[PDB]
């Protein structure tokens, strides 16, 4: 009723893309509606999902965590880099503030050099602006 399956069920009700695979579970984050636009500032209206993020994340409380910021094809490479690192740092500091051991954390904001979708179509770019959370 509030178990792992429950919290991933209403997680995808709050559509934060959850990967269970192997041990490395991965969370994919629509940066846009989990931010204010073009900003490092977290969309704090989207709190209850994030609460449940940490709720489920505590079920793997030893695994170290890749996280990764992602952009789309636009502006300077230096820009995309920089903004993605901003987004990266704020979510990892969000975690270190969530009370997760700062040496379990590792972050990188890739300015779109990965692109799980395209960018040349719009819904694809919408899928492109995302955050990766690998952890083992």
């Amino acid at each position: 009723r509030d178990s792992k399956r429950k919290i991933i069920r209403d997680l995808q009700k709050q559509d934060i893309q959850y990967v269970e695979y192997g041990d490395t579970r991965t969370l994919i984050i629509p940066t846009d509606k989990y931010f204010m636009f073009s900003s490092p500032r977290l969309n704090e209206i989207c709190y209850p999902g994030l609460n449940n993020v940490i709720r489920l994340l505590n079920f793997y409380p030893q695994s170290t965590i890749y996280v990764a910021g992602f952009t789309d094809n636009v502006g300077s490479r230096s820009h995309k880099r920089k903004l993605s690192q901003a987004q990266a740092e704020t979510m990892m500091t969000f975690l270190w503030a969530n009370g997760i051991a700062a040496k379990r954390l590792k972050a990188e904001g890739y300015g779109d050099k990965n692109a799980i979708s395209d960018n040349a179509i719009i819904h694809g770019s919408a899928q492109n602006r995302r955050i990766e959370i690998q952890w083992f």
Binding site: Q12, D15, I16, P30, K33, N73, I122, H123
Partner: protein, 138 residues
């Protein structure tokens, strides 16, 4: 029950085709900016002509599209700087459009000075309370 994460509002073709207009012209701008910034080395800043000062570090967030002088009076009156102007205005107005959010006024002046590249200039004497606007002389 499966779903992709980013579920936005519906767009339309209009703003769609606007967007791929925009990005193409944007990246032509980007490469333009590169090629000019290497063909010409930028030698000096404008912070020496516009240095910062206490009560000039008040902040502002602005949209604007009009002429320059009304806007620069508004900032000088908020900064309690006497605003003066040298040289006469051209018949065509130096029109500028500053649209930004939350920075200090000194940088707002800096980008104003840049946006009125080689038609206007800002000199600030904050030992006094002087914001002076120098016009171009053609």
């Amino acid at each position: 029950k499966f779903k992709k994460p980013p579920i936005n509002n519906p767009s339309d073709d209009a703003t769609i085709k606007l967007a791929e207009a925009a990005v193409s012209v944007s990246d032509s701008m980007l490469e333009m900016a590169k090629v000019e910034k290497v063909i010409t080395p930028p030698s000096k800043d404008n912070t020496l002509t516009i240095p910062n000062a206490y009560n000039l570090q008040a902040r502002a967030s602005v949209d604007w599209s009009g002429p320059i002088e009304e806007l620069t009076a508004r900032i000088a009156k908020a900064a309690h700087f006497r605003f003066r102007v040298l040289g006469k205005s051209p018949s065509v107005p130096v029109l500028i459009s500053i649209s930004t959010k939350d920075e200090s006024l000194a940088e707002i002046l800096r980008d104003i000075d840049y946006q009125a590249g080689k038609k206007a200039s800002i000199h600030v004497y904050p030992n006094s309370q002087v914001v002076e606007l120098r016009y171009a002389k053609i």
